[PDB]
Amino acid sequence: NRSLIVTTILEEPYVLFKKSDKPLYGNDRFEGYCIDLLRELSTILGFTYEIRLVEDGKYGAQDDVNGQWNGMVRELIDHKADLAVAPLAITYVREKVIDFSKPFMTLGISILYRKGTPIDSADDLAKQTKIEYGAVEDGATMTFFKKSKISTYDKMWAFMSSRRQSVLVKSNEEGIQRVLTSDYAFLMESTTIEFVTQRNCNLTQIGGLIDSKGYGVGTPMGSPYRDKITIAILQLQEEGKLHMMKEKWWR
Amino acid sequence: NRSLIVTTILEEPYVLFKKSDKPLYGNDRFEGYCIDLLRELSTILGFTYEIRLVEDGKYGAQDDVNGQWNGMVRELIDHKADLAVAPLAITYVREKVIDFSKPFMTLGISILYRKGTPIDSADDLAKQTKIEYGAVEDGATMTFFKKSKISTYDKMWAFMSSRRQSVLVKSNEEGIQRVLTSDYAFLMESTTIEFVTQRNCNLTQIGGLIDSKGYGVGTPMGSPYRDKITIAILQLQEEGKLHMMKEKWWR
Amino acid sequence: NRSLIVTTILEEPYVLFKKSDKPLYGNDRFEGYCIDLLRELSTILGFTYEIRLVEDGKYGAQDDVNGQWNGMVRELIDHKADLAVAPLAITYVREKVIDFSKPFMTLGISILYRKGTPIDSADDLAKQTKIEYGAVEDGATMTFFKKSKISTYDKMWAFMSSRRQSVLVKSNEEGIQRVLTSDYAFLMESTTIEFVTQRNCNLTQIGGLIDSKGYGVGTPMGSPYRDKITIAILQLQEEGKLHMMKEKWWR
Amino acid sequence: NRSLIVTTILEEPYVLFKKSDKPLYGNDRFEGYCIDLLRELSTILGFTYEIRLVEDGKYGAQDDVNGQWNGMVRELIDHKADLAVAPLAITYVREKVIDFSKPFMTLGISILYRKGTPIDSADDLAKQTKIEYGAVEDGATMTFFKKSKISTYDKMWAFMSSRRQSVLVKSNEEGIQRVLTSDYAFLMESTTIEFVTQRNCNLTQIGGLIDSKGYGVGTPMGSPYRDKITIAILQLQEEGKLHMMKEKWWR
Numbered sequence A, B, C, D: 001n002r003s004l005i006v007t008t009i010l011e012e013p014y015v016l017f018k019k020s021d022k023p024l025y026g027n028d029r030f031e032g033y034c035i036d037l038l039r040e041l042s043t044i045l046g047f048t049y050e051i052r053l054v055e056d057g058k059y060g061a062q063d064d065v066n067g068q069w070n071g072m073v074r075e076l077i078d079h080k081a082d083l084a085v086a087p088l089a090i091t092y093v094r095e096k097v098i099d100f101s102k103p104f105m106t107l108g109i110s111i112l113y114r115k116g117t118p119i120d121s122a123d124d125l126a127k128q129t130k131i132e133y134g135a136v137e138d139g140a141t142m143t144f145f146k147k148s149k150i151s152t153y154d155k156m157w158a159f160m161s162s163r164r165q166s167v168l169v170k171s172n173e174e175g176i177q178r179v180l181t182s183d184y185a186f187l188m189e190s191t192t193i194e195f196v197t198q199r200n201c202n203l204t205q206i207g208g209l210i211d212s213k214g215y216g217v218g219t220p221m222g223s224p225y226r227d228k229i230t231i232a233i234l235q236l237q238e239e240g241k242l243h244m245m246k247e248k249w250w251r
């Protein structure tokens, strides 16, 4: 009955360093929606744990050359963690190498941009090359465009790909600052856009959702914990706890 | 220089009868998001108008037999109205018979149901036959399921169709009541679900968005007003007026 | 420049018949806080007037069956009076049919009862059915309970409603005597409770204020006099005249 | 059979240092409404006690960061006192961490200001930014505004918060002086306003009560003294002793 190693990633308001005038220890060092979720999972299912930040700082994507995965997905594959509790998108390509619990939140890719412009959709971005746009490198949004067969999205990936180092960023925070400082549109997940626009009155979502997906807890393929976590999540959902947590962290 | 005839439909909070102690006349008899939109359109483009409620009380669907359309769509086809300003979904099948302005709002089909249940997605509904589910008859949501080739949605339509008279309702309002008084789940548009859940704390959206679409102003095919209205809408969007209108009527 | 018809209602110490060994005429026939107020309004704004007692002897409520109003509210609606100067509560439902000046006095609903009992709140009354309680029929207090969604108040209305003819009275004076003669608690406005308890040492207020409201001068909707009266009232308030009038009539 | 430690706070006329030429000892060093109440409680329930002044000088509020409470509330939580007998407001947020006896007095938040001004309500204050307004830091009134969802009160808090160090004071006394020496309106409890206006003829309450609440004796959660104290208070209330105590200290 050893403590489980839970990998996650810094992402407001799901996971962040808790601030305090005095020293913090162990799990108390972190806070956020996913941290509250993890706590609930541990008491419902009866396990102890330790929080680890994904070492390469990535969510997870497959390398073009060697086909190897990185990020949290890879840490689960290599059994460097028992669980991945973070805003981790459940995707078909990931389901091939790791397992996911049922979703604890639903969302979709959308566009973050400055308000007061004539850009009103992805098509408005794809039809021009002046305004640059991108996404978080090695994340689910990037992979969506990289694998899309939809004309507009295919051309958008061709654009991003050709300017990979200039338009792909290392985090949502970096993408947001890019939007606030230059003529740049950012492809990010709707749930995070909701949080951002609520705090940056000069920003807004552009258009609707480009796709639909959900966040789930990740486990190494075959892990006996996956089905147990799904039971816990469904219980939290039904009792309205997940709704309560969303309200608390989004305000 | 005659006034334009604008067809619409009662649907809170887009269009409703304005309440007052003193007799109301003309366009002042109605109010709502779409009524405010119509007003802005008239002063920006320079036209006067009169509001008409779609005679058959339907949004618009194609008949299986004669293949003819009904509702607002049909009123436009037969030139019984110059414009249709309402929460009218822009869809491929409709675009074949009428024209649409660019969208003034984005949304997607989703599920409305009571809180505290184990139903967490459409799949949860489709895999069972105990709790019934449906949509508004002759609307875009019903048509979506009727034309879908996605397994889950395909069997969901088989279900609805076989119990058409018992599960398909005449309005969102009827559906909401059906949900509050019986084991029934309702397929409706996210923007309306948003309005409903904020006023019915026992209800909640189930899962995420099943599709993505937008509302646009409808015009008879070939109408010279379509492109002009698109220009007006984009201006209202860019200046933040559409966002202001949404906040005013949803709150 | 005809004299205005001012409707009011007998209610100590706002309005009462002035006593005198010799015959009294015109406006000299009445006295009280509201009569002093009316006089001030007439000289500040420059108008003459005649005092009329509301014919049906009611303050004003909407009928359940036909939705018609009665009391002073109805006399204003039917233009049977230019102004209503009395302890008339400014309420949302009334604002729909008549206009009110800014408040000239603030108050709240409370409970009048005998002292020396274990009843200490509305909850103490609502949890039992032995001690009866009520309010003035067709007044603002009755309407407050009739429209309240607050559990305790909802159950209290269910009680009063089921015993309407036995517990609802025609006036505060009738309610007070009911309290002095039988095991009965009376829901009345705090300002009047203040006057009563000061003269009936055996009575007392129970609990705090159940709501907050104010008294205002009523006028038919759209009356040009409403804003003028507000100016007069605010001036009287600022100079301390309203405070002086309260002290004079409450002692 | 040890004496109980009772925490309280200096606040006229509930608690103050008794003045005398000869040295005073023990409980005789204090006096006031709450000191008389405490005395009656001790003889009715059969306990001895010692009075302690809350060390941090605060009533009690929850910290935004660590979420910890301070003031008398915190002294009770940490069992640094057996009882808190003072004008301690019974509130929902406090009831989550400590217990309260039934109320021994009812009141509501209101506005204290100079007479002869055009300010007649909270709205009059909230619609302007010239004259400043505030409340006692870390008290129930401040918390009310900080948690309110009522538009007017919401913007009033935005105002106070943005000028926290300049408008939030350490005591009612500081607030009263702030009102007598500058263009400042003070949000304080009605029962205290009542005491102040009777001794400061230039001051007056503005508008009516903004909310309704009561003062109760606080105890650590689960304390066996809570229900016993409620019984004592209800007895004092029924016999008219609480009314007598109010008259004695307010006059």
Ligand SMILES: C[C@H](C[C@H](N)C(=O)[O-])C(=O)O
Pocket (backbone or CB within 6 Å): A059, A060, A087, A088, A089, A135, A136, A138, A139, A140, A141, A142, A171, A172, A187, A188, A189
């Ligand atoms: C940053 C985010 C990561 C995304 N939640 C994932 O799981 O890879 C994105 O791709 O937009």
Ligand SMILES: C[C@H](C[C@H](N)C(=O)[O-])C(=O)O
Pocket (backbone or CB within 6 Å): B059, B060, B087, B088, B089, B135, B136, B138, B139, B140, B141, B142, B171, B172, B187, B188, B189
């Ligand atoms: C009621 C609604 C109608 C839909 N807005 C339309 O344009 O047909 C629906 O189909 O869900």
Ligand SMILES: C[C@H](C[C@H](N)C(=O)[O-])C(=O)O
Pocket (backbone or CB within 6 Å): C059, C060, C087, C088, C089, C135, C136, C138, C139, C140, C141, C142, C171, C172, C187, C188, C189
């Ligand atoms: C008697 C009184 C009337 C109340 N002042 C009104 O305006 O209807 C009450 O309802 O308590």
Ligand SMILES: C[C@H](C[C@H](N)C(=O)[O-])C(=O)O
Pocket (backbone or CB within 6 Å): D059, D060, D087, D088, D089, D135, D136, D138, D139, D140, D141, D142, D171, D172, D187, D188, D189
């Ligand atoms: C000073 C007073 C404290 C208040 N009686 C309390 O219990 O926190 C206030 O908040 O207005």
